[PDB]
Design an enzyme around this catalytic site. Structure first.
Site, PDB file in Angstrom:
ATOM      1  N   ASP C  58       1.233  -1.504   0.572  1.00 25.77           N
ATOM      2  CA  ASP C  58      -0.184   0.146  -0.160  1.00 25.77           C
ATOM      3  C   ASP C  58       0.985   1.109   0.091  1.00 25.77           C
ATOM      4  O   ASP C  58       1.774   1.926   1.005  1.00 25.77           O
ATOM      5  CB  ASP C  58      -0.806  -0.086   0.815  1.00 25.77           C
ATOM      6  CG  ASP C  58      -2.167   1.572   0.824  1.00 25.77           C
ATOM      7  OD1 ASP C  58      -1.509   2.556   1.242  1.00 25.77           O
ATOM      8  OD2 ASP C  58      -3.241   0.632   1.096  1.00 25.77           O
ATOM      9  N   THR C  91      -2.612   7.518  -3.655  1.00 26.00           N
ATOM     10  CA  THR C  91      -1.281   7.318  -2.987  1.00 26.00           C
ATOM     11  C   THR C  91       0.232   7.499  -4.428  1.00 26.00           C
ATOM     12  O   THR C  91       0.694   8.165  -4.049  1.00 26.00           O
ATOM     13  CB  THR C  91      -0.931   6.339  -1.998  1.00 26.00           C
ATOM     14  OG1 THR C  91      -1.866   7.546  -1.425  1.00 26.00           O
ATOM     15  CG2 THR C  91       0.525   7.610  -1.201  1.00 26.00           C
ATOM     16  N   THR C  92       0.821   6.431  -4.646  1.00 22.82           N
ATOM     17  CA  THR C  92       1.644   5.277  -5.550  1.00 22.82           C
ATOM     18  C   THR C  92       1.188   6.624  -6.671  1.00 22.82           C
ATOM     19  O   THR C  92       2.570   7.113  -7.315  1.00 22.82           O
ATOM     20  CB  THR C  92       1.360   4.267  -6.023  1.00 22.82           C
ATOM     21  OG1 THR C  92       1.681   3.609  -5.051  1.00 22.82           O
ATOM     22  CG2 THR C  92       2.773   4.078  -7.306  1.00 22.82           C
ATOM     23  N   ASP C 392     -10.661  -0.332   1.953  1.00 22.89           N
ATOM     24  CA  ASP C 392     -10.260   0.343   0.741  1.00 22.89           C
ATOM     25  C   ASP C 392     -11.487   0.206   0.129  1.00 22.89           C
ATOM     26  O   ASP C 392     -11.525   1.061  -0.695  1.00 22.89           O
ATOM     27  CB  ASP C 392      -8.987  -0.076   0.160  1.00 22.89           C
ATOM     28  CG  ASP C 392      -8.565   0.807  -1.202  1.00 22.89           C
ATOM     29  OD1 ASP C 392      -8.232   2.001  -1.178  1.00 22.89           O
ATOM     30  OD2 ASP C 392      -7.813   0.306  -1.802  1.00 22.89           O
TER      31      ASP C 392
END
Lengths: 156, 527, 525, 527
Positions: C58, C91-92, C392
């Site tokens: 994550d 986020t990545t 998520d």
């Protein structure tokens, strides 16, 4: 705190300037004069000076006292060197020249701290000096009895 | 907690420093040069003060001559060295006016900073300084008022050299002027090259300066080792050989095969030594001078033939004597020298200042070498006077090289500042700002004379300009009394070192330019 | 440097140096997270100081649990952390865009330009990218089948490709069966509980709720049918008076009377409970289960046990909200007006013990509007992997329920958007053309990293996709199985507008602020 | 001279280490797991050797049971932990076969290394392992040979539990089989849920194992503190209150105003205590059990009414006793208890092994609880025998849950390897390489049985395949004698535990896959 640049001009010297430098120079001359203050006159005292080995010399002549003080102060040394010259020119002008020179500075000490440009100090010193030595020549006495018992008695 | 900044791009040194840019390199070089100029400012001018400097050898040197102070102070900053080196070239070129280099070059760099912070980079300030400098050298030939052409005798030179003496030895400007005048004329080179190395100084501890004198010849501090110290005919032989006979150059050994050879060997050697000394005695020689040792038998025979001996260990001192007495130093053992003998008028020994000295005095053939004998109560005084003597000797040479004089006392500098400014005002461009600043670099010089004289510099400099309203061009700065009330320099008699000012401007300008051209500095690791 | 003159221990960066420091840290972070983009990404082993092992990829955990000490990396971590509060995943992608906006800018700033120029262009490029984003919104009427595709698109990226078939149904059904009539869904109505029973692929969805504590008396029923649930926050343990005075008595006989007397306030509170069981037509089992959230002494528990009443204790604050709703009861804070109307209903209540830990199950509710997901992972790290996937996934489908439209897939918008920026490149009419070039190319970092993580040639993959779009009208992107261009609507990959909005805004604000720092310093210590 | 390599791009760590790549991360995780597989290999099988392990508390454990050895080995490697932790789910689910994990999952990891170096990466090797695992779950249900359905009595249970004993307690396979059968059968749940918590173990130091026995009741290691040690009627009342009276909970303070109130105060305490004990004496109370202390007056009255006291400080002992004798624990002082008392047949104290114990013996109501009393010369013997008792208790539960037995002795594992290999040979793709290796992971298991038995493993394996020519499926390893001489396992009675083999294959495969899916290791600094 203030003279802290990134690179210094020279290396790591000490430097003083102005009125506090003269005051210290005069004060050091007053201290070195103390060695001979009590050696003047027929009723003066002798000194016993011991070196780092334990060897002692007893005398009252400035030609011995002033050479063994081991003075390191840059200015106070002057009141010793003048005795070396008097030893050559007079032969016994020793203790008296150190004390007189010290007094010349003391008498002007209260004035040199408040302006009084050094040039006028030198002018006054030279003026009075030339007058004093001229008067001596006008008052010294001589004899007209050379090659007589009177001259031998004069030497005694 | 709090992180630290990482490396950036070139962290490959082992602890070395690095500077670049207007603020980190250029201004820092200028700032170091300011400290140098300030250090020597206090001693500037005839009213300057002395420094007492203790060097890395624990020796005390006291003077006001920056040329000898700077060589004792261990200046390390690479920028300050550039001006110090220029001041050494000034000493080499004319031997005087060295103060100029630090005062003028410092002013150029200080004023350059004022321009760099508001406007043009060094790429134009340097060019503007050169434009103004070139004009300064067209102004200087038009400021000449006198020349050292008339009355080339002892009386005029006693007046021409005073400006170089009073600048360091204020109260002795008359006494020393008389002594140096007697020396400068004594080696007149028959209107040829004035050889400054033919005037020496001999320091003898004793009474004050009034007892100093000039001796037409040489004085040594050695002994005679005999009882013939007073010589009147002074027929002098000089040798470089030792006074003990002939020796081998490799080894040598004595082979004896019979008693007669053993017994007669020593006696034969003494007989040979007698002949070796007689060889020169037969010529009428009075004095034999050597740099070598003297044997016991040589002294035996020296007394037999009434020969005076002098030993001078220094080869340079003996060579100077050879040119003084008119003799050749022979490297071989003493032949009957006839045609290479020297002559003096009186050779004697005396005890002067509790030092036994040997005097070679000339009265007829005087102009070969002169010795100026200085007395004083301290070594510090005598060392400083000796430097004052050097200035008089070198100044005479400078006067021979170029006989023109321009008014001193700041008069030349004010005229340069005024005329240079007028030129800049007519330049239809940006160079007028650096040209005007070049002029201001000169104004800083009479300001320094006022500051050390105890008078208010802002009013003094206003008067120096006020009295040059196109019709004067000769009034300078009076530093002899409170409230200068500026006076004519030509009536005062203050004017000197025209050639010195010519080269001093060139050397001072080049030092300032060299500093300004450094934009980046790469240092080695300190150690 | 001025700060070094004031404080010899002060740090400063030069104008030409601070930019390199900021970019280098961004490149370091890019070299980490680029390896986890998409279902083809790698899994990291995070070894902590206690010895705990987390096998995760994550984007948020990798940025948090890393030993990177740098003043610039600490700033990207901040904007990255916010991702998981307002949009969840992505986020990545946030960090990847920032890294290329800072990296590509260096190739124009270093070539004689002022950093202001590239940042003015970046702001202009954002406006054009935002206008394009509005033109690709797809309205699919938010059918359940669309939500399945959303759940699978997100879940695949956090599972081992076997668990997706289990969680997909648990995510879609759990999020829907909460609220109706276009009312915002509160995720606090969905529980996640952890057990160590069997395997990852045995996660269950429980219609009712489970409590982490069970009966505290051996005579209480282990299985209760047709139960009435009483949810009270009353205190049935022994309490003293406020004033610490105590008892004053003479005889031992009075001592015993004081024991009987001081406890009367407990019986007055407990005896009001036992009446309820008798008022709910107790001619059959008619189980009575009382939660009693606060502490309760064994005196009160035994008094209730004698009547055949099951009582719990020491529940959480959030248990009394979800349970009161789920059972249909009334939350009471006093015993002033007790009546059967306050009681809930549950078809079955039972307990199960695993590893000497009791779990209490309250199930068979009509419409509890709250569900519990029961994770049966075999190991500690497997409980963490799944719990992150569940929360998520619930967010991914919630956003697709709140947002009336969906956005085409991983690279379907990023490539076409970059072309939209280049097609208008000269319209800036100035020096900002390079900012458009840098921005349009930075947008491609997503299909570019996806091509590499899937093992396909970087350049051939993008040339084929850009050509297929340029000569057609379809929003084709990267296919992670073949490398050929395919349409997102046909492969079943979607994104949310809220994710693309934040990526275009948050990456521009941060990147343009970093590029305009040129004097990094440290002082005050 | 000596250069140094600079940093590269991201040296932002503070001492953390990183590993990545097939060789630096994946293979190192595989090899670390092999080291643990070797550690426990020596103890594998009934012919294995014991370890003497001293843990971080300086406690000595001597056993061959890997379930307890692994709990004392302080493994820190971040990946090796995972294959160890898997063994906990094996013990929790069925209570036996924990050795399977390190052997089978370890073999899968080692065998993967043989493929990852020459061909496909883990994304394909894992797929082959998972496909082959699914096939193993289709083969195993067709290898079941017997079911524990008939003759559910003392003699069949003794035989059925043999495998759970002879695998660790080699020489005690008969003696312990009789004892454990008596304990499991005595609480037979009438073909319902077998409660493994109703069998206790009591360790008493003394003579050898032959002196162990099973006692239908509970044994405590406390004293009486009284003189009523022989009880025949044994009506037992259990209380949670201390046997010293009752006080208030608010505060309590006794106030006296005059002398009569003082003098008659103490008398009230004696009157209350007498009546409180009499209340239960009149009801036939024989034994009173408390968790608390006993007052001096409580002992006075306990002896007056001939009632035995027992103090059990353990809350679990009080709970188990109430469930054993059929009593309710009362939190209040002793009322005239009428119906809450339990019943035993003989309650007495005895000195056994120089320890005085309290025995609550049940002869009629036997199937409530059993205690297995273990004797031995050392604590190490008694602790190890207890583990054998637990294996039997757990095995009984497993058979109750699932009564199917699968041939043991390596017969099933060779057959699984044979059929799984044949499947792989028919797979039209590259996945056959890992499927065949999945089969070899099973062959590794009887190889371990051969090595520790003192026979050459290569010869054992060759024979085991030669005797399985499509129609046998039952010959395994004979490890009771020299020379392999493989024979039928079912004639000997070596079979058990379908559920364990089913779960173990699924779990061990998942553990191996978990390690293989790890791509990168990020280490923290230790503290």
């Amino acid at each position: 705190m203030m003279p802290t640049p990134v690179i210094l001009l020279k290396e790591g010297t000490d430097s003083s300037q102005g009125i506090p430098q003269l005051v210290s120079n005069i004060s050091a001359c007053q201290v070195i004069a103390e060695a001979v203050r009590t050696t003047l006159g027929p009723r003066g005292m002798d000194k016993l000076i011991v070196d780092g080995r334990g060897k002692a010399t007893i005398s009252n002549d400035g030609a011995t006292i002033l050479k063994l003080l081991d003075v390191v102060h840059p200015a106070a040394k002057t009141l010793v060197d003048i005795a070396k010259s008097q030893d050559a020119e007079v032969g016994d002008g020793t203790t008296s020249v150190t004390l007189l020179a010290a007094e010349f500075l003391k008498q002007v000490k209260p004035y040199v701290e408040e302006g009084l440009h050094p040039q006028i100090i030198i002018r006054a010193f030279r003026t009075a000096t030339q007058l004093a030595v001229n008067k001596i020549k006008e008052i010294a006495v001589t004899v007209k009895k050379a090659d007589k018992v009177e001259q031998r008695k004069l030497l005694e | 907690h709090v992180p630290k900044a990482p490396g950036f791009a070139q962290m490959l040194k082992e602890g070395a420093k690095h500077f670049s840019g207007l603020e980190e390199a250029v201004y820092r070089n200028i700032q170091a040069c300011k400290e140098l100029a300030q250090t020597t400012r206090t001693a500037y001018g005839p009213n300057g003060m002395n420094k007492m400097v203790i060097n890395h050898l624990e020796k005390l040197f006291v003077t006001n001559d920056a040329a000898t102070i700077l060589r004792e102070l261990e200046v390390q900053h690479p920028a300050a060295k550039m001006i110090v080196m220029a001041s050494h070239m000034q000493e080499q070129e004319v031997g005087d006016g060295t103060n100029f280099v630090l005062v003028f070059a410092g002013a150029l760099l200080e004023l350059a900073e004022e321009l760099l912070r508001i406007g043009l980079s060094v790429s134009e300030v340097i060019e503007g300084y050169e434009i103004a400098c070139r004009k300064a050298h067209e102004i200087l030939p038009n400021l000449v008022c006198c020349s050292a052409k008339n009355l080339r005798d002892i009386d005029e030179v006693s007046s021409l050299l005073r400006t170089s003496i009073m600048s360091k030895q204020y109260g002795n400007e008359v006494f020393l002027a008389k002594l140096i005048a007697q020396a400068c004329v004594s080696i007149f080179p028959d209107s040829g090259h004035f050889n400054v190395d033919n005037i020496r100084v001999c320091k003898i501890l004793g009474s004050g300066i009034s007892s100093s004198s000039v001796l037409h010849g040489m004085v040594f501090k050695k002994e005679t080792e005999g009882d013939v110290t007073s010589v009147k005919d002074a027929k002098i032989a000089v040798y470089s050989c030792p006074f003990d006979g002939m020796i081998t150059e490799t080894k040598g050994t004595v082979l004896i095969k019979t008693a007669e050879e053993l017994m007669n060997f020593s006696k034969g050697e003494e007989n040979l030594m007698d002949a070796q000394v007689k060889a020169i005695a037969d010529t009428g020689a009075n004095v034999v001078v050597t740099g070598g040792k003297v044997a016991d038998m040589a002294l035996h025979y020296a007394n037999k033939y009434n020969i005076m001996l002098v030993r001078l260990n220094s080869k340079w001192d003996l060579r100077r004597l050879c040119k003084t007495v008119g003799a050749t130093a022979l490297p071989r053992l003493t032949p009957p020298v006839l045609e290479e003998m020297g002559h003096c008028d009186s050779v004697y020994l005396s005890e002067v200042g509790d030092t036994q000295v040997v005097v070679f005095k000339h009265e007829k053939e005087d102009g070969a070498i002169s010795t100026i004998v200085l007395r004083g109560s301290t070594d510090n005084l005598m060392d400083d006077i000796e430097r004052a003597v050097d200035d008089g000797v070198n100044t005479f040479k400078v006067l021979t090289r170029d006989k023109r004089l321009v008014p001193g006392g700041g008069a030349t500098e004010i005229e340069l500042a005024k005329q240079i400014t007028s030129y800049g005002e007519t330049c239809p461009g940006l160079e007028q700002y650096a040209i005007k600043k070049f002029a201001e670099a000169f104004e800083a010089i009479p300001r320094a004379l006022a500051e050390n004289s105890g008078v208010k510099a802002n009013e003094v400099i206003s008067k120096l300009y006020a009295v040059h309203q196109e019709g004067n061009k000769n009034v300078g700065l009076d530093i002899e009394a409170e409230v200068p009330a500026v006076k004519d320099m030509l009536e005062a008699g203050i004017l000197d070192t025209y050639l010195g000012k010519y080269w001093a401007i060139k050397l001072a300008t080049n030092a300032a330019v060299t500093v300004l051209r450094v934009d980046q500095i790469i240092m080695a690791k300190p150690a | 440097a001025a700060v070094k003159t004031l404080n010899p221990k002060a740090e400063v960066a030069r104008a030409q140096a601070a930019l390199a420091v900021n970019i280098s840290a961004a490149r370091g972070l890019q070299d980490v997270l680029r390896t986890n983009l998409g279902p083809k990404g790698t899994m990291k082993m995070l070894v902590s100081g206690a010895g705990d092992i987390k096998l995760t990829k994550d984007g948020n955990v990798l940025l948090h649990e890393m030993q990177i000490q740098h003043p610039t990396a600490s700033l990207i971590a901040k904007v990255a952390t916010a991702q998981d509060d307002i949009t969840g995943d992505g986020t990545t992608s946030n960090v990847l865009i920032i890294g290329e906006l800072l990296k590509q800018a260096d190739l124009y700033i270093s070539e004689g330009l002022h950093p202001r120029i590239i940042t003015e262009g970046f702001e202009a490029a954002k406006e054009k990218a935002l206008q394009f984003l509005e033109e690709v919104k797809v309205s699919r009427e938010m059918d359940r089948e669309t939500l399945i595709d959303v759940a699978r698109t997100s879940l695949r990226t956090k599972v081992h490709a076997e668990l997706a078939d289990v969680l997909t149904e648990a995510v879609v059904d759990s999020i829907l069966a909460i609220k109706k009539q276009d009312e915002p869904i509160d995720l606090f109505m969905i529980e996640i509980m952890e057990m160590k029973h069997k395997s990852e692929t045995d996660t269950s969805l429980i219609r009712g709720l489970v409590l982490d504590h069970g009966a505290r008396h051996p005579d209480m029923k282990k299985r209760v049918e047709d139960a009435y649930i009483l949810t009270c926050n009353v205190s049935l343990e022994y309490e003293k008076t406020e004033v610490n005075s105590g008892f004053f008595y003479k005889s031992a006989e009075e001592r015993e009377k004081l024991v009987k007397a001081e406890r009367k306030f407990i019986e007055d509170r407990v005896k009001k409970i036992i009446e309820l069981k008798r008022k709910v037509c107790g001619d059959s089992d008619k189980g009575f289960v009382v939660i009693n959230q606060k502490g309760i002494d064994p005196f009160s528990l035994d008094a209730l046990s004698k009547e055949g009443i099951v009582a719990l204790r020491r529940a959480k604050r959030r248990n009394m909200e979800r349970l009161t709703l789920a059972c249909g009861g009334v939350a009471l804070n006093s015993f002033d007006d007790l009546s059967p109307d306050c009681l809930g209903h549950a078809g079955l209540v039972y307990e199960y013990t695993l590893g000497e830990e009791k779990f209490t199950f309250i199930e068979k509710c009509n419409n509890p509007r709250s569900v519990t997901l029961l994770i049966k992972g075999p190991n500690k790290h497997t409980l963490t992997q799944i719990k992150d996937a569940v929360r998520d996934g619930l967010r991914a489908v919630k956003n697709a329920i709140d947002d009336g439209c969906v956005v085409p897939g991983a690279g379907a918008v990023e490539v076409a958007m970059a072309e939209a920026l280049i097609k208008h490149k000269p319209s800036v009419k100035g020096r900002a053309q390079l900012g458009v070039q840098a921005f349009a190319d930075a947008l491609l970092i997503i299909p570019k990293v996806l091509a590499q993580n899937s093992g396909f040639d970087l350049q051939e993959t993008l040339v084929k996709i850009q050509a297929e779009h340029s000569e057609s009208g379809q929003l084709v992107g990267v296919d992670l199985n073949t490398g050929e261009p395919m349409v997102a609507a046909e492969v079943g990959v979607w994104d949310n507008y809220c994710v693309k909005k934040q990526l275009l805004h948050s990456c521009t604000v941060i990147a343009t602020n970093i590029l305009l720092v040129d004097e990094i310093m440290r002082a005050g210590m």
